[PDB]
Symmetry: D2
Subunit: 329 residues, 4 copies
């Protein structure tokens, strides 16, 4: 169209304001390259024979897939080569990766290189999740520097490999959506300064765990099906990939839940590279993100791979649920 | 790789056996071209400004979307130009389209040009559904020729615009999956002669209608959450696009339900271009497809736009549900 | 645009007229798949490390390149699998390939799988050339069936991997250009029934052989630079890939020459899979194609790999040259 | 491959050394986006109906084409939005474009947005040419700042839309080739620190102007055809697009000539955005670039649209020609 707002440009201009080393741009710019490479391998994964196990288990017990490994090498290498990072945390690595001194920059990046594992083989939409923190310490970089609360985030978001490829990016001022254009391989701004509705009509949870749910979730779900005021019941949606279910929740509004259950005190989703980035996006969009007892973004992690319940979405729906928990406490 | 099994080749060879006019190949071959064009517009739909209403209502009351209109023109035109069709039924047209005499062939094609409407804007996977019948009558072609039971189907299947684009094709001998390769725009065979597991671990239904469900569905869902034998409960998945939920059901096994409810005697999904094609795929894959009272494929339609409950999936799961209905009858 | 004239459709309709086995369509349709695969590997050849020698010499003494080998396997396999061919002649194979009995069809296809070898590494436009003959004999298929004059051709043309990818196709009624659309991988009709100008302003020959040229070529070139009537001199163009130089000659008009020289009685270009297909295109376009002494299309070959001088182009320019040769004879 | 040297990365690292504002990277990075957009429109130009005149004449008398206009808007807009430029000179604009104050940076960029005009319609390879100078003056930016000799260049090069898309980039330390990967839309390093052979075997000139050539060119051409030492004659190549002929000359070696003629005292190629960028590339590659009487890079321009003879290539060939001119002087 001959004037093209790309994620690359939009980023200079934003951080142009606060005169900067500009290495955030180099960082985000390297992450896009990793995102396009993953998007491309995923669009042809059965032709490239990329579905299957790799033959290892990761620290949180996931059966690793070939695409986990490809997308993880891709993200690690482009992050290093950006000269903008010093500590990397990934779902797929037991410990934090410390960047070699020549390539160090001031940022720590937590990421899930491929989220949605149960959905790879059936071609359901899948994604990549990331959060970026500035290094706070003066000490030599270490795993410690990844142990900050989600409120310290400077940038967060995700790539969605859906019917189209979208890069959702949240920073201190707001949330912006960029769609990948396959013909020129740029990320193009499509939604500016996104805000989630005050209240939704959709609830998204895996109801197969009904037997393990706490009484607050149980009551809340029953209320979504049998409204007390005789309003229309909520529709149910659970795609089964966090990135897809959170993304719909952002665009259409509503609520997404992966609560603590009887079996899991801490839920299943991982705090550093699933829960915090999603909660940061939601908060920057005007929504909320809570365990049922406290804000996800205030938790000080003690383990890079720790888990957390999460309930996120429109503020009115998330608040109604918080009240049920307070009512039971 | 220099030997390429494309959907085009695989089709000559199959129908090569029964020496043929070969116009089925011309037909399926034209449908691929429509499928690649739709796949391409969908991958860049927000950049092309293709999300939104068109500003009409279709015969079954859907709020029409720009992509409904594009994908529907694309399918109509390529079907005509194939010289293989005489009657077209589409979700988006009040009546059957009769093909102009110069372009007539012996096939009637029912299709949903873009399925998954609620999922377009949030980038969730979406699709195209079709079923092909031979003309049975000697009369001038008419809407009548689309009114055959699903058992008369000669070919059926769907395109899935997911993380990758897949063409699932069922014919008298079996079901085969072809993945679109974006670099050369061919459909490449990836799964040969697919069979669905005897029994699954996943149930897929919109539980927001709990208040309208009949007692058979209600009991069946409660049994999936609280197993009587104390086996692990089923996981829940509901993407919200028929094509995506059926596809997962085909690959991983399990069950998919869009049952009659108190509000809808006939359910919501449409018999000619949603229920029959999916039920034909399932049956050709070794699964089942029933209203709760009879086989989808035996219903003789009386209206091109009529609806039908549908419950489809692994034979063991679909049978357990049928028993509950018999138990209540 | 929702009505798409593809090479696939245009071919059914043409041969629809003369009711046919339709295996020409299957043939041309398989050749497109090979053409898109080659087009794709060529667009990324330095990234895939596809420039270089393969490490063999072919029958006419060419230093073979990796891309020669890839494009040649691709063309052989798709031709076989089309069930439309019984004898294949390729630049890259010492002898004619006889197709295994199960896959036999009635066509013999001569082809140059990758033309333009000197131009691969410098990214200059390159191509694929082919001619198709019906089998005339009743004998078991043999190399003999490829030894027919170019006038027996039923179809001929070329793919050009230039700034865009074009498939030029000549058949009994005329010449049509199809451009490959990278987004949907179809060949789309762009120029219908092409005709070359009666007279051009461009001459295309490698003038580095001035010392070996016969006196007819020498005089003709001097006349192009110093017109006797004081008209503007012709411009010179020599891309150095037959497919590119012939294609420009077709579109803009003019003349292309690879004449016999003192060193080569028969010139360098190869009769079966370079000279005949190009001469058939030219003649179907209203131009001419001659050795300097006789029509290329009338030569009865005695060797699948024999060479022939060729001078082709607008009829007025090619005739002026023929007169010079008659004048010298 | 999971480690990807892109033009983007390679540029940070180079200019990383000399700690910088980094706006050269932003500049080159914006130019790539323009280059991919042009590459994409050119690959489908006949399907998009992009061949034809626009219906104007530019300052140096060229009949303007639709693609001239598209590629020129694309380059202007991405240059502005980079915040790295203050003065733009383009073939297609009568005067220098002064950038609006908010978007000013320190660089002046001269460019030919689409070179190769005679070759667009016949699908011959075409290109984009550019040279970048730092602003030297303290005055408000003006056309004056584009009037520097080619020796002041900080960066120069070209995009080639050939069988593949290549970005050739010359800077103070050397010349590097990046190939565009269509699947991820990045420029990937393929040739590092390119050097042109000391001596070639190819001469590239439009011999249709034989009647207007000076006696030095005439003798030089005759020597290429009739070697005095009885070595093999040079091959001739003239694609007819400067970018293609210069690129081959860089890779294979040899010589390229667009000399002053009797009709044109200054030749035809344009100094600011054709001759200088090409001469800078050549010199950085170890070759030479001369008018026949002086180095192209030393000419102080007096007019943004002035023309210059140019003879460029391997140093041994270019020197032999210079000697002929000295011999005639
Ligand atoms: O199958 P479950 O227990 O509902 O898990 C679904 C969740 O698991 C994940 O795959 C991560 O493991 C998320 O993407 C998704 O939200
Ligand atoms: O929102 P609901 O009532 O669950 O409808 C979902 C169904 O509707 C459809 O969009 C068709 O209208 C299907 O693709 C999907 O199965
Ligand atoms: O280098 P030469 O002798 O001019 O050969 C050019 C010819 O050679 C070919 O590469 C075939 O060998 C043709 O494509 C082209 O016309
Ligand atoms: O047709 P001519 O006079 O040889 O001009 C060819 C030159 O013209 C250009 O098109 C620029 O006008 C160059 O790309 C090419 O070198
Ligand atoms: Mg995992
Ligand atoms: Mg995850
Ligand atoms: Mg993961
Ligand atoms: Mg609808
Ligand atoms: Mg539907
Ligand atoms: Mg629909
Ligand atoms: Mg060869
Ligand atoms: Mg050849
Ligand atoms: Mg060849
Ligand atoms: Mg021009
Ligand atoms: Mg130019
Ligand atoms: Mg130009």
């Amino acid at each position: 169209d001959t004037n093209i707002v790309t994620l690359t440009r939009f980023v200079w201009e934003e951080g142009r304001k606060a005169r900067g080393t500009g290495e955030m741009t180099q960082l985000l710019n390297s992450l896009c390259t990793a995102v396009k490479a993953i998007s491309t391998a995923v669009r042809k994964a059965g032709i490239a024979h990329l579905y299957g196990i790799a033959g290892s288990t990761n620290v949180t017990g996931d059966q690793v897939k070939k695409l986990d490994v490809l997308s993880n090498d891709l993200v690690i290498n482009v992050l290093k080569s950006s000269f903008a990072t010093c500590v990397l945390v990934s779902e797929e690595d037991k410990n934090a990766i410390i960047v070699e001194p020549e390539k160090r920059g001031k940022y720590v990046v937590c990421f899930d290189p491929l989220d949605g594992s149960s959905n790879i083989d059936c071609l359901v939409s899948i994604g990549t999740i990331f959060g970026i923190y500035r290094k706070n310490s003066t000490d030599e970089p270490s795993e410690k520097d990844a142990l900050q609360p989600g409120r310290n985030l400077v940038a967060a978001g995700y790539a969605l490999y859906g019917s189209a490829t979208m890069l959702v990016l949240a920073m201190v001022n707001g949330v912006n959506c960029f769609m990948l254009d396959p013909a020129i391989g740029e990320f193009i701004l499509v939604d500016r300064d996104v805000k989630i509705k005050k209240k939704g009509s959709i609830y998204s949870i895996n109801e197969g765990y009904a037997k393990e749910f706490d009484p607050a979730i149980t009551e809340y779900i029953q209320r979504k099906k049998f409204p007390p005021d005789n309003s229309a019941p909520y529709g149910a949606r659970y795609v089964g990939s966090m990135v897809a279910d959170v993304h719909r929740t952002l665009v259409y509004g509503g609520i997404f839940m992966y609560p603590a259950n009887k079996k899991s005190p801490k839920g299943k989703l991982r705090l550093l590279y699933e829960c915090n980035p999603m909660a940061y996006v939601m908060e920057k969009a005007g929504g909320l993100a809570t365990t049922g007892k406290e804000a996800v973004l205030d938790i000080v992690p003690t383990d890079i791979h720790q888990r957390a319940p999460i309930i996120l979405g429109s503020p009115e729906d998330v608040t109604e649920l918080l009240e049920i928990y307070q009512k039971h406490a």
